């Protein structure tokens, strides 16, 4: 299953996830893809900021869904 990770500036990154994959496992994939560590990576889909020990399926993220990738500095 593929999901889109939309960055800030306008880069769309297409990842291949299982929906039985964790939010942690999406960050791992981006560390692989882009080189970003998961420390900085915050994810947003709708309103809340997604925690690591839950799956895409929990959150109810479908096929070809757009997640927003926020790069953590401190917090904002």
UniProtKB/Swiss-Prot annotation:
Coiled-coil blocks: none
Source organism per UniProt: Homo sapiens
Location within or outside the cell: Cytoplasm; Nucleus
Cross-linked sites for Glycyl lysine isopeptide (Lys-Gly) (interchain with G-Cter in ubiquitin): 6, 11, 27, 29, 33, 48, 63
Domain called Ubiquitin-like: residue spans: 1-76
Record PTM ADP-ribosylglycine, positions in chain: 76
Record note on modification: Phosphorylated at Ser-65 by PINK1 during mitophagy. Phosphorylated ubiquitin specifically binds and activates parkin (PRKN), triggering mitophagy. Phosphorylation does not affect E1-mediated E2 charging of ubiquitin but affects discharging of E2 enzymes to form polyubiquitin chains. It also affects deubiquitination by deubiquitinase enzymes such as USP30. Mono-ADP-ribosylated at the C-terminus by PARP9, a component of the PPAR9-DTX3L complex. ADP-ribosylation requires processing by E1 and E2 enzymes and prevents ubiquitin conjugation to substrates such as histones.
Position of the Glycyl lysine isopeptide (Gly-Lys) (interchain with K-? in acceptor proteins) cross-link: 76
Modified residues (Phosphoserine): 65
Main function: Exists either covalently attached to another protein, or free (unanchored). When covalently bound, it is conjugated to target proteins via an isopeptide bond either as a monomer (monoubiquitin), a polymer linked via different Lys residues of the ubiquitin (polyubiquitin chains) or a linear polymer linked via the initiator Met of the ubiquitin (linear polyubiquitin chains).
Modified residues ((Microbial infection) ADP-ribosylthreonine): 66
Protein name: Ubiquitin
Outcome following mutation: residue 63 to R: Abolishes HLTF-mediated polyubiquitination of PCNA
Effect seen on changing residue 48 to R: No effect on HLTF-mediated polyubiquitination of PCNA
Signal sequence extent: none
